[PDB]
Write a protein that holds these residues in place. Structure first.
Motif, PDB file in Angstrom:
ATOM      1  N   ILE B  54      -3.036   3.398  32.413  1.00 36.67           N
ATOM      2  CA  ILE B  54      -4.113   2.502  32.012  1.00 36.67           C
ATOM      3  C   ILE B  54      -3.947   1.174  32.734  1.00 36.67           C
ATOM      4  O   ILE B  54      -4.647   0.201  32.437  1.00 36.67           O
ATOM      5  CB  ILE B  54      -4.141   2.299  30.489  1.00 36.67           C
ATOM      6  CG1 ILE B  54      -2.853   1.624  30.022  1.00 36.67           C
ATOM      7  CG2 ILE B  54      -4.336   3.622  29.783  1.00 36.67           C
ATOM      8  CD1 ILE B  54      -2.921   1.089  28.618  1.00 36.67           C
ATOM      9  N   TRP B  55      -3.019   1.122  33.681  1.00 34.42           N
ATOM     10  CA  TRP B  55      -2.779  -0.075  34.470  1.00 34.42           C
ATOM     11  C   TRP B  55      -3.723  -0.179  35.651  1.00 34.42           C
ATOM     12  O   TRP B  55      -3.735  -1.209  36.330  1.00 34.42           O
ATOM     13  CB  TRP B  55      -1.345  -0.084  34.994  1.00 34.42           C
ATOM     14  CG  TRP B  55      -0.332   0.324  33.994  1.00 34.42           C
ATOM     15  CD1 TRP B  55      -0.445   0.283  32.634  1.00 34.42           C
ATOM     16  CD2 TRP B  55       0.933   0.915  34.271  1.00 34.42           C
ATOM     17  NE1 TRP B  55       0.690   0.782  32.049  1.00 34.42           N
ATOM     18  CE2 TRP B  55       1.552   1.179  33.035  1.00 34.42           C
ATOM     19  CE3 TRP B  55       1.611   1.231  35.447  1.00 34.42           C
ATOM     20  CZ2 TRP B  55       2.811   1.742  32.943  1.00 34.42           C
ATOM     21  CZ3 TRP B  55       2.861   1.791  35.354  1.00 34.42           C
ATOM     22  CH2 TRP B  55       3.448   2.043  34.111  1.00 34.42           C
ATOM     23  N   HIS B  59     -11.603  -3.163  36.314  1.00 32.63           N
ATOM     24  CA  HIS B  59     -12.582  -4.220  36.512  1.00 32.63           C
ATOM     25  C   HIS B  59     -12.379  -4.891  37.862  1.00 32.63           C
ATOM     26  O   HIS B  59     -11.257  -5.001  38.360  1.00 32.63           O
ATOM     27  CB  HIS B  59     -12.486  -5.259  35.397  1.00 32.63           C
ATOM     28  CG  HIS B  59     -12.746  -4.703  34.034  1.00 32.63           C
ATOM     29  ND1 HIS B  59     -11.878  -3.836  33.409  1.00 32.63           N
ATOM     30  CD2 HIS B  59     -13.773  -4.892  33.174  1.00 32.63           C
ATOM     31  CE1 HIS B  59     -12.361  -3.513  32.223  1.00 32.63           C
ATOM     32  NE2 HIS B  59     -13.510  -4.140  32.056  1.00 32.63           N
TER      33      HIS B  59
ATOM     34  N   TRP C  17      10.337  -1.627  33.819  1.00 38.48           N
ATOM     35  CA  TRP C  17       9.233  -2.494  33.431  1.00 38.48           C
ATOM     36  C   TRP C  17       8.074  -1.734  32.804  1.00 38.48           C
ATOM     37  O   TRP C  17       7.285  -2.334  32.068  1.00 38.48           O
ATOM     38  CB  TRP C  17       8.733  -3.255  34.654  1.00 38.48           C
ATOM     39  CG  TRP C  17       8.364  -2.346  35.776  1.00 38.48           C
ATOM     40  CD1 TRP C  17       9.213  -1.740  36.651  1.00 38.48           C
ATOM     41  CD2 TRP C  17       7.047  -1.921  36.136  1.00 38.48           C
ATOM     42  NE1 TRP C  17       8.507  -0.968  37.539  1.00 38.48           N
ATOM     43  CE2 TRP C  17       7.174  -1.064  37.245  1.00 38.48           C
ATOM     44  CE3 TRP C  17       5.773  -2.186  35.632  1.00 38.48           C
ATOM     45  CZ2 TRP C  17       6.076  -0.473  37.856  1.00 38.48           C
ATOM     46  CZ3 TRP C  17       4.686  -1.598  36.240  1.00 38.48           C
ATOM     47  CH2 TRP C  17       4.842  -0.750  37.338  1.00 38.48           C
ATOM     48  N   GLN C  18       7.950  -0.435  33.079  1.00 36.47           N
ATOM     49  CA  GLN C  18       6.778   0.312  32.640  1.00 36.47           C
ATOM     50  C   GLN C  18       6.679   0.404  31.126  1.00 36.47           C
ATOM     51  O   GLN C  18       5.595   0.677  30.603  1.00 36.47           O
ATOM     52  CB  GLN C  18       6.795   1.711  33.251  1.00 36.47           C
ATOM     53  CG  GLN C  18       6.735   1.712  34.765  1.00 36.47           C
ATOM     54  CD  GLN C  18       6.419   3.074  35.338  1.00 36.47           C
ATOM     55  OE1 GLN C  18       6.584   3.312  36.533  1.00 36.47           O
ATOM     56  NE2 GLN C  18       5.965   3.982  34.484  1.00 36.47           N
ATOM     57  N   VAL C  21       4.547  -3.128  29.781  1.00 34.54           N
ATOM     58  CA  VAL C  21       3.326  -3.541  30.462  1.00 34.54           C
ATOM     59  C   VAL C  21       2.266  -3.804  29.403  1.00 34.54           C
ATOM     60  O   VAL C  21       1.939  -2.919  28.606  1.00 34.54           O
ATOM     61  CB  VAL C  21       2.857  -2.476  31.463  1.00 34.54           C
ATOM     62  CG1 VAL C  21       1.399  -2.689  31.813  1.00 34.54           C
ATOM     63  CG2 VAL C  21       3.708  -2.518  32.712  1.00 34.54           C
ATOM     64  N   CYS C  23      -1.547  -4.710  28.856  1.00 26.20           N
ATOM     65  CA  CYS C  23      -2.870  -4.746  29.458  1.00 26.20           C
ATOM     66  C   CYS C  23      -3.855  -5.314  28.450  1.00 26.20           C
ATOM     67  O   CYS C  23      -3.853  -4.916  27.281  1.00 26.20           O
ATOM     68  CB  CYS C  23      -3.301  -3.350  29.905  1.00 26.20           C
ATOM     69  SG  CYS C  23      -2.521  -2.791  31.429  1.00 26.20           S
ATOM     70  N   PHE C  25      -7.090  -5.184  27.543  1.00 19.64           N
ATOM     71  CA  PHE C  25      -8.398  -4.558  27.421  1.00 19.64           C
ATOM     72  C   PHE C  25      -9.195  -5.106  26.252  1.00 19.64           C
ATOM     73  O   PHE C  25     -10.414  -4.920  26.207  1.00 19.64           O
ATOM     74  CB  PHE C  25      -8.250  -3.046  27.272  1.00 19.64           C
ATOM     75  CG  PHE C  25      -7.770  -2.368  28.511  1.00 19.64           C
ATOM     76  CD1 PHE C  25      -8.579  -2.296  29.625  1.00 19.64           C
ATOM     77  CD2 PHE C  25      -6.511  -1.806  28.564  1.00 19.64           C
ATOM     78  CE1 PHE C  25      -8.142  -1.681  30.766  1.00 19.64           C
ATOM     79  CE2 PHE C  25      -6.069  -1.187  29.707  1.00 19.64           C
ATOM     80  CZ  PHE C  25      -6.885  -1.124  30.808  1.00 19.64           C
TER      81      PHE C  25
END
Ligand SMILES: [Mg+2]
Ligand SMILES: [Mg+2]
Ligand SMILES: [Mg+2]
Ligand SMILES: [Mg+2]
Ligand SMILES: [Mg+2]
Ligand SMILES: [Mg+2]
Ligand SMILES: [Mg+2]
Ligand SMILES: [Mg+2]
Ligand SMILES: [Mg+2]
Ligand SMILES: [Mg+2]
Ligand SMILES: [Mg+2]
Ligand SMILES: [Mg+2]
Ligand SMILES: [Mg+2]
Ligand SMILES: [Mg+2]
Ligand SMILES: [Mg+2]
Ligand SMILES: [Mg+2]
Ligand SMILES: [Mg+2]
Ligand SMILES: [Mg+2]
Ligand SMILES: [Mg+2]
Ligand SMILES: [Mg+2]
Ligand SMILES: [Mg+2]
Ligand SMILES: [Mg+2]
Ligand SMILES: [Mg+2]
Ligand SMILES: [Mg+2]
Ligand SMILES: [Mg+2]
Ligand SMILES: [Mg+2]
Ligand SMILES: [Mg+2]
Ligand SMILES: [Mg+2]
Ligand SMILES: [Mg+2]
Ligand SMILES: [Mg+2]
Ligand SMILES: [Mg+2]
Ligand SMILES: [Mg+2]
Ligand SMILES: [Mg+2]
Ligand SMILES: [Mg+2]
Ligand SMILES: [Mg+2]
Ligand SMILES: [Mg+2]
Ligand SMILES: [Mg+2]
Ligand SMILES: [Mg+2]
Ligand SMILES: [Mg+2]
Ligand SMILES: [Mg+2]
Ligand SMILES: [Mg+2]
Ligand SMILES: [Mg+2]
Ligand SMILES: [Mg+2]
Ligand SMILES: [Mg+2]
Ligand SMILES: [Mg+2]
Ligand SMILES: [Mg+2]
Ligand SMILES: [Mg+2]
Ligand SMILES: [Mg+2]
Ligand SMILES: [Mg+2]
Ligand SMILES: [Mg+2]
Ligand SMILES: [Mg+2]
Ligand SMILES: [Mg+2]
Lengths: 121, 258, 213
Positions: B54-55, B59, C17-18, C21, C23, C25
Motif C-alpha cells: 500500500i506504499w 496519488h 523499516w517495512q 511504514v 501511510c 490515506f
RNA sequence: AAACUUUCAACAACGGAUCUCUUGGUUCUGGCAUCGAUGAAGAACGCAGCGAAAUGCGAUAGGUAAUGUGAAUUGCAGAAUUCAGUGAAUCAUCGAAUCUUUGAACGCACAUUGCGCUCGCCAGUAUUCUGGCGAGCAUGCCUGUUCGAGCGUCAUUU
RNA sequence: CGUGAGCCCGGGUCGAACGGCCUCUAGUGCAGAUCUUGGUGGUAGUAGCAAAUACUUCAAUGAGAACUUGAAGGACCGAAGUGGGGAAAGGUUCCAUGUGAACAGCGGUUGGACAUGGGUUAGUCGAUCCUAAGCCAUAGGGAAGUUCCGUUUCAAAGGGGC
RNA sequence: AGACUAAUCGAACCAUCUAGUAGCUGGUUACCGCCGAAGUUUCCCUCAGGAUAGCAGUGUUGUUCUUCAGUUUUAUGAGGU
RNA sequence: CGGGACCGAGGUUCGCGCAUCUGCAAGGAUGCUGGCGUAAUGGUCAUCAACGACCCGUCUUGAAACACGGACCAAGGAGUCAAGGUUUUGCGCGAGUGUUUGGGUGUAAAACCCGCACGCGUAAUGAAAGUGAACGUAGGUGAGAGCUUCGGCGCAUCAUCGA
RNA sequence: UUGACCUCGGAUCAGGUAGGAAUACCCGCUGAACUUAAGCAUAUCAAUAAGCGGAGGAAAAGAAACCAACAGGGAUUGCCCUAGUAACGGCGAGUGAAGCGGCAACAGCUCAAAUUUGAAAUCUGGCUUCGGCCCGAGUUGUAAUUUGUAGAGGAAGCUUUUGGUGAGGCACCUUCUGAGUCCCCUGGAACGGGGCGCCAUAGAGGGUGAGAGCCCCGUAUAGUCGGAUGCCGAUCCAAUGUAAAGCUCCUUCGACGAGUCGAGUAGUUUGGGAAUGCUGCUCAAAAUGGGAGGUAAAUUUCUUCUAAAGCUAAAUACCGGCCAGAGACCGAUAGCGCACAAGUAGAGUGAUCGAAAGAUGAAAAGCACUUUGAAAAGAGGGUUAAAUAGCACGUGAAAUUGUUGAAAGGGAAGCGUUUGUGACCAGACUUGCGCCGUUCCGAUCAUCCGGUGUUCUCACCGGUGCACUCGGGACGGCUCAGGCCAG
C-alpha cells in the motif's frame, strides 16, 4: 442516485441480504400489485400476499389463469395457486411456483389486521 | 495482498539426494499437502512475486498552475464548434457554441420535468437523448465489482452559486449524462473527460459575468501568453509579405522521372 | 558496490523499516472529522468565541527576533496593569501564563492596550438574567452581532516592522565618524581583548607600580 | 492383400482446461469501547417426530418468559381451532429466567464419576448408624468483630 | 491478409455477454528451471500373485460354487499347540436377520465388509483402602518473572470427650 | 562403539527469527528493423569476483568553403636485430 | 549481319537527340491471332521421387556428443515496489519556484481556493575567529554561426593574457 | 486480683477484593543470532525477534531544578521542517538527535512542611432510618486555611454567592409517502426489438423464467404515526447574609520534600564526545542554598528554574473485538489455510502439521408404463426450449484411447527446395460505359417568394413535347474495355 452513508449499493451485499432474509423479511419482499378496482378503492399500490388471497397470473406460461392462493411458500420465494399445476411422470399433479411479482391481487382476504394495514398506507 | 499470504507454513527444503527439486516442501504425512512445495512464486499455494504494498504512489502531485493552465485550455476548447463535434456531441442545432442561457429561465428548474424541457428548448435535447439511449453493460469483471454500465457524457450545466443558487442542481440529477458545476470550481475531469477536449457546456447568464472575476481572483496565475500570436498558418504563408520574398518554386509537386 | 560517478548514498533502510511504514490515506478523512469536531465545539461554546485571547510575543532567537507571534498567555504583570483579576480572566476567554516575565516596558504596554481593547468590546451576560450585577453588561448594550473566532480579529497585524520608510533629505541621518565597517571591527576587537586589558590594569607591573608607590 | 505401426477428420471415450458467474477473500476509510469468583475464554457430554455432521441450546435443553410483526413451517403427517386468534413462525426484538460435568476453578483429589467434614429437613426403633433432599467448607489481602498469647509493658490490689 | 508476432471469415457445438479506436494502468506473453499442482502414456495384459506338507466325492442353496453349508473319506497342529483363559492395546470387531456396489491383491451365495436391531446385571471378582521407588501442597527462602528449592524446617501446625 | 536418546545423533524433534547469506549451480515468457563487442591496462586477503581504463549503443550539440589519414613520395633523425 | 535465352519495371504532354517538312528505334511493350471460360490456370493437404537436413536448452576456446536438464499434456511460473540520487526527454513558472503539515469549501477519500513559515536557488572561501566578489562599454588577443549601411559588428563556445 | 496499652495470632466471624481470558495499539523488564562490514572479534542487525509482568479505549507524558543567550520564549502530546544536520564510529561499514519556526489541540490543579487549641470542628461500621444514637478509627493528627503564580497577619475601601420553569435543537430507535405489466414480432419465458405513454429532489442497488426508472423491495426530499432516557439554553418568577470569597496598598514575616543531590568506580545504554540516561557498590551535602548553562580543573561574575510527593481531557496510535461504507484489487491451482459439515477429514507419543472439495434446469418437471436380464442395467416410451443438460449433471480443450473413413511403411520418423499424382477448394468470369434506331414522363426560357460564395440555386407556374427538346424501360446495330492459358 443514493446519498446515504448508512445504506450500501454493493451487489454482493444486496444479494446476501436477499437470500439470507428471515421469514419476516421475506414476507415484505414477497408482495404483489393490486388490481385497478382495488387500487382505487383502497388507495394502496401493493401489499404482501396472504395464503387465502385470490390472484391472477400476468407473466409466464400461465399468464391468464387465476384462482385462490393455496400456499405462500416463503423459502423458495414462490406462490402456489389453485389449479395451476403440472403433471409428473406418474401422472400426479404438483403445483408450479409463481413469483409474487408475476401476479396481481384481484381479491383480498380482509381481516382486522389487514384492514389496519390498508389504513396505514 | 495480505502480508502473510503464502508464508503460513513451516516448509523446509529437503536438499539434494532425494531426486526432487530443492524447493521447500511441507512436512507431515497424513494429508495431500504432504510433500508439496510451499514457498515461491511458481508453487501452487505460494506467494506472488513481489507482493503488492500500500506504499505505492497512488496519488500524483500536479503543479497548481499547470492545473489552471489546462483548465483554461479546456474552457477555451469548449468554445470551438469543431472540437465539440470531434468529441461526439450533437450540437448541430446550437446557434452559438458558448451557449449562454438567461439565468431567469432557471427559476423553476428544480423539477426534473422542467429541467429536461429547458435543455430541449435551448438545443441540447439531442445530446441529452443520446446519453440516455447509450446505456450498455460493460465488458469484463467490472460488472462483478461495482461498475455495471456505461452511458456516455452529455452537456455540462455551469451556474453561479451565489446568484443562481443551489436549487438548480436538484433538477439535473436523474437526467443521464447531464451534470452540473459551479462557476468557481470548474473541475477539469468534467471539462475534458478522458483527456479529450471540447465538452459541450451550457452556461447561465450569471455564470458568464463571474467568469472574469473568477480568473482575476486566482492569485499567482495570469492568463498565459502563446508561443504563436496568429494561430492561422494559411494567412501567414499566403501573405503578401511572405510571398514577395520567395525565390520562385524550384520544382513541382510530382517530379518527372529521370 | 559503487559503480560510477555517483553520490554516496545515505539511505537508512537497514533496520526492517517495512514494519514501521505509516501511510496517510486518512488525510482527507481526518480533515473532515476535525471539522466536525470544530463545529460541535463552536455550537456548545456559542455565543462565546471558540478560542481565547492571547498576547503578542517576540520570537526568542537572533534568527527570529525580527518577528512577533502569538504567545501562550498574558503575564501577571500585564493582567494586573489592565485591571483584571488573575482568576477572572480564564472565565472570560483570556489566556493566562504565570510563567512568563516582562523585562521591557514596551512589550508590557503593547499587551496591556490589547487587554483593554478586548475588554472594551467584551459583553458579559449576567449570571442570572433576572438580577444583573455591577460587572454584567446591561441588556441594552447586548446586540447579538458577535464574532466567531478571536484570533481572526485579534491576530498579529504587522509581524515584521515595515522597511519602506521615506524621509526628507533635510532629515538625513549623519554618518558614523570612523566608518561603519570600522565601528564593527572595533566592537569585535573590544570584546576579544576585554580580558587582556582588564588583566593588565591590574597588571603585575601595575600592581608593582601600586606596590612601589 | 489383411494384421501391426504412423498421420488426419467425424463420432464416442478419459480428463476438467477455457468462457461466463459468485451469500467468499483482500485492502482502505468511518464510528464505537463492552469479558471474568454475580464464575470468563476454552473443553466434555447431552437435547429434535423422524439427525450423523454444521448451527442453536442445557434436564425449563434445535429451547421458556416478555415485546413487535401479523398467518405460517415444509422433505411427510403432524398446528385447521392457533381464523378474532386471548396470535402461526427454524420470524424479529430481547430488559425476565433456566444454564448438565468441568475449566482462573475454590472441601481434599482426580489416569477414580474417589474420599471427606458442618448444619437443617424427611424415612428407617436412632443426638452417634444408614439412605434421600437442601445449604455449605480454597488461598492471599483489607476494614471491623470477638476470642486469646507474650515478666514487651503501665497502674492498683496484693 | 501480413516478412512476422497475429488478424479476419465460412462450417459444427454452445447459451449471456462482448468488441474496435485514443489515452491511462499492470500480478501482461513460457519449452525447459532433477520447476509447482492436476491429469495421462509406453513399458504391459508384462513382473508377478511359489515359506507355514493337502485335498477329494455326493447333496443342498443359488443366475453363478476350488476357497458357502451338511455328510463321507484323507490329512495337519501333536499340550513351551494352529487348544482353553487373561494383562496391556483396540472399541462393538460380540449375536441374530438381510445384502446391490466397494473391501477380502483369484472367486464368493461367505465375512472382523455393508444395513437394521439386540447384547455386558456383584456386600463376596477388581478398582475404591495402605504404603514403596517417587511426585505435589503447607512454613519458609531465592528469582525481574514464568517460577525454583523445601516435605519437617529457625511454624503459636493437631486430635478427642461431657 | 562417538554408542543410544521414538526408522533422526561427531549434538534429537517442533515453531519462530527466516523469503537467513551465497563472488557458486540452474532457469529467466511475442515479432521485425538498425547498430554491434571483450577475454586486454592498473589496483584489490586479488587468481571461479570486483573497481578502473579500453572496445559498443543511444541521445545530442558546434557545424556542414567542418578536417584529417593503420597510405605513398621528398627531405632529415634514432636503433644494434 | 545472323541463331537463342531471360526480362516489359514506369504510366497524360514536357527532356536529351536524330531526321526533314512525314516523323523516329530518341526520359522502361506494343500490335495481331487462337483455345477455354472452367476446376483449365491457381491454392491447401496427403503421398511418391531428386537433392539436402545430427536434438533442443545450457555452461564452454570448442556440443550431435560417450557433458547436464528434458516420458507427455493443461494451468501457474521469475528485473517488481518505496525512499533517496544522477543524466537525458516533455511540460509550467522563472530570480524565483513548490497549494494539498494545516485552514476554507464541497455534488464529500474527488474538484476548487488560501496563506505564514519552510525546502532548494540567488555567494563563496577558511579547521576556525572571520572576511566576502567592476581600473576598464564586466577587459584585451585569436577563431567563430548570423547580420551588414560591404566598413565592419560579431551570439554561443574554445584557446590565451589579465582584473 | 483486676483493668489498660504495645506487638503477635485464631475463627466456615460481618462485609469485600485479587487471580484467568485478551494483548492489534500501550507501559516496563529481559534479551539473541542469522545479516552487513565482500574475512572477523568492537560495531551493525538491535536498545529488534523470542520470553516475563501490567492497563485502557486509548495508554503513556504532562503543568519546568525546561529551552535559551535573544528585543527573550513558557505544561504535555502529534505533524512539517530542523536534518541525513551537530555528533558518534576498527572515524571503516554504518548510525544520528535537539533548540528555534508553521500548524492540530488546549486546562489546570492536590499534598508535606504552621497550634481549631475558647473546645477532632473529621471518618468507617451497626441500629434507627424518624431525628439521631452506639462501638470503633484518630492527637504518633482526621476536618478547615496555604502550595511559591504565592501566601499569612494588618485596616480602609469596593465587590461576590442561592434555588426553581423549560421551545427545541439536537442526539435514540419506529410507521408512511412516484410513475405501463398498453399494442405487434421473436422466444419455453420479454426484462429484447418496434410503436404509443408516464414519474423523476427518486435513471444507486437487488429480485422477478434473458439488458426492467414506471412488476416487487428499496432509492431522493423532507415532515408525521409514535414512544425511552438524559444534555443544553430563552423568557419568566423566589430570595436572602451568616461569617466564605476576591480586588488595591505597603511594614512585618514567609515553614518549601535526605542514604536524596552530588562525587568516585563498574556494567549497560546513548548522537551526547575527561563519561547522555539507568542501575549496583563506596563516600555522602547545603541554605540565597541547589541544579542546569553539551571540554576536564581552580578563581570571580551572570542567566534561568526550584529536584528528591501527586492528579489531570484534546490533538496521537491501533481494523485484535463490535458495526458500517467503499475499491482502476482477486476471481475457485486466484483471493485468507478455509466461497463447501475448515483449523474440518487426516498424520504424529507429543510440541505441532494440515488438505481436497463451487455451477443440472426457469421450474424436479429428477424418466410413468412395456419388454430383455438373477441384477446392475439395456431397448422402446415419456419430461424439457434442450438430455448434444440424467443428479458420474453449465460449456467440455489437450495429453491418452476405441470405431469408421482416407493413406503410407526393405534396420527410425520428422523437416527444407522442387515437380508429378490423388482428394478438396477460394477467387475471377456472367457484363459495363458510350453513339444511333421504339414506348411512357418533364427540359430551354420567363415570371413570383425565399436563401446565397452577388450570381448560382430550391420552393408554385407558364415548359406542351412521335423520328423535335429533357428523362426513363422495353428491344436492335456499332466502338471501346473486360477473365485464364498461349503462338
Ligand atoms: Mg530418475
Ligand atoms: Mg508429412
Ligand atoms: Mg443461463
Ligand atoms: Mg507474472
Ligand atoms: Mg501459461
Ligand atoms: Mg508448460
Ligand atoms: Mg520435470
Ligand atoms: Mg505372467
Ligand atoms: Mg515369489
Ligand atoms: Mg510350561
Ligand atoms: Mg492366552
Ligand atoms: Mg461374527
Ligand atoms: Mg477379490
Ligand atoms: Mg468379485
Ligand atoms: Mg514444589
Ligand atoms: Mg573413532
Ligand atoms: Mg534410532
Ligand atoms: Mg532459504
Ligand atoms: Mg590488502
Ligand atoms: Mg562457471
Ligand atoms: Mg567498463
Ligand atoms: Mg639487445
Ligand atoms: Mg546477338
Ligand atoms: Mg489442381
Ligand atoms: Mg495444378
Ligand atoms: Mg518425400
Ligand atoms: Mg545428407
Ligand atoms: Mg528458453
Ligand atoms: Mg572444458
Ligand atoms: Mg564422444
Ligand atoms: Mg552441470
Ligand atoms: Mg534425465
Ligand atoms: Mg504550503
Ligand atoms: Mg523562499
Ligand atoms: Mg574573455
Ligand atoms: Mg560478514
Ligand atoms: Mg560475503
Ligand atoms: Mg562467516
Ligand atoms: Mg516481544
Ligand atoms: Mg493517564
Ligand atoms: Mg537541506
Ligand atoms: Mg543504533
Ligand atoms: Mg564505565
Ligand atoms: Mg541490557
Ligand atoms: Mg556512562
Ligand atoms: Mg500521570
Ligand atoms: Mg443447448
Ligand atoms: Mg447443457
Ligand atoms: Mg458437462
Ligand atoms: Mg485428442
Ligand atoms: Mg525387420
Ligand atoms: Mg498439386
Amino acid at each position: 442516485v443514493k446519498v446515504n452513508n448508512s445504506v450500501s449499493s454493493s451487489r454482493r451485499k444486496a444479494r446476501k441480504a436477499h437470500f439470507s432474509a428471515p421469514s419476516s423479511v421475506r414476507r415484505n419482499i414477497m408482495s404483489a400489485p393490486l388490481s385497478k378496482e382495488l387500487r382505487e378503492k383502497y388507495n394502496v399500490r401493493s401489499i404482501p400476499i396472504r395464503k387465502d388471497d385470490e390472484v391472477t397470473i400476468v407473466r409466464g406460461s400461465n399468464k391468464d389463469k387465476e384462482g385462490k392462493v393455496t400456499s405462500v411458500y416463503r423459502l423458495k420465494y414462490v406462490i402456489h395457486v389453485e389449479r395451476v399445476t403440472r403433471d409428473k411422470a406418474t401422472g400426479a399433479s404438483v403445483p408450479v411456483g409463481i413469483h409474487p411479482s408475476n401476479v396481481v391481487i384481484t381479491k383480498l382476504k380482509l381481516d382486522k389486521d389487514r384492514e389496519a394495514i390498508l389504513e396505514r398506507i | 495482498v495480505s502480508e502473510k499470504a503464502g508464508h503460513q507454513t513451516s516448509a523446509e527444503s529437503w536438499g539434494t539426494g532425494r531426486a526432487v527439486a530443492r524447493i521447500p516442501r511441507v512436512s507431515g504425512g497424513g494429508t495431500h499437502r504432504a510433500g508439496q512445495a510451499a514457498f515461491g512464486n511458481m508453487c501452487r499455494s505460494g506467494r506472488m512475486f513481489a507482493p503488492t504494498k500500500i506504499w505505492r504512489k497512488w496519488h500524483v502531485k500536479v503543479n497548481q498552475g499547470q492545473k489552471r493552465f489546462a483548465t483554461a485550455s479546456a474552457l477555451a476548447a469548449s468554445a470551438a464548434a469543431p472540437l465539440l463535434m470531434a468529441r461526439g456531441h450533437q450540437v448541430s442545432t446550437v446557434p452559438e457554441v458558448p451557449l449562454v442561457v438567461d439565468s431567469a429561465a432557471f427559476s423553476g428548474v428544480n423539477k426534473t420535468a422542467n429541467a429536461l424541457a429547458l435543455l430541449k428548448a435551448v438545443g441540447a435535447g439531442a445530446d441529452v437523448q443520446k446519453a440516455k439511449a447509450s446505456k450498455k453493460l460493460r465488458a469484463g469483471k467490472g460488472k462483478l465489482r461495482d461498475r455495471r454500465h456505461r452511458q456516455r457524457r452529455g452537456p455540462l450545466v455551469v451556474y453561479s452559486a451565489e446568484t443562481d443558487g443551489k436549487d438548480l442542481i436538484k433538477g439535473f440529477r436523474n437526467i443521464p449524462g447531464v451534470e452540473t458545476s459551479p462557476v468557481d470550481a470548474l473541475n477539469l475531469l468534467q471539462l475534458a473527460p478522458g483527456g479529450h477536449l471540447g465538452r459541450f457546456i451550457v452556461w447561465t447568464s450569471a455564470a458568464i459575468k463571474e467568469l472574469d472575476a473568477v480568473y482575476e481572483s486566482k492569485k499567482g496565475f495570469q492568463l498565459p501568453a502563446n508561443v504563436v500570436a496568429q494561430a492561422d498558418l494559411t494567412r501567414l504563408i499566403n501573405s503578401s509579405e511572405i510571398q514577395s520574398v520567395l525565390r520562385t518554386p524550384k520544382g513541382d509537386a510530382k517530379t518527372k522521372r529521370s | 558496490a559503487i559503480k560510477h560517478n555517483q553520490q554516496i548514498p545515505n539511505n537508512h533502510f537497514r533496520k526492517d523499516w517495512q514494519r514501521r511504514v505509516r501511510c496517510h490515506f486518512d488525510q482527507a478523512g481526518k480533515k473532515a472529522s476535525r471539522r466536525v469536531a470544530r463545529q460541535a465545539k463552536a455550537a456548545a461554546l456559542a455565543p462565546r468565541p471558540v478560542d481565547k485571547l492571547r498576547p503578542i510575543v517576540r520570537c526568542p532567537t537572533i534568527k527570529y527576533n525580527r518577528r512577533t507571534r502569538l504567545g501562550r498567555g498574558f503575564s501577571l504583570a500585564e493582567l494586573k496593569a489592565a485591571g483584571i483579576p488573575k482568576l477572572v480572566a480564564p472565565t472570560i476567554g483570556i489566556s493566562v501564563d504565570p510563567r512568563r516575565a516582562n523585562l521591557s516596558e514596551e512589550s508590557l504596554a503593547a499587551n496591556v492596550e490589547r487587554l483593554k481593547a478586548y475588554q472594551a468590546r467584551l459583553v458579559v451576560f449576567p449570571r442570572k438574567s433576572n438580577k444583573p450585577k455591577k460587572a454584567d453588561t446591561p441588556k441594552d448594550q447586548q446586540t447579538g452581532e458577535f464574532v466567531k473566532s478571536v484570533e481572526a480579529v485579534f491576530g498579529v497585524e504587522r509581524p515584521i516592522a515595515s522597511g519602506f520608510k521615506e524621509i526628507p533629505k533635510s532629515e538625513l541621518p549623519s554618518n558614523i565618524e570612523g566608518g561603519a565597517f570600522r565601528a564593527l571591527r572595533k566592537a569585535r576587537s573590544d570584546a576579544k581583548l576585554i580580558g587582556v586589558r582588564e588583566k593588565r590594569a591590574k597588571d603585575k607591573a601595575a600592581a608593582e607600580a601600586e606596590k612601589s608607590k
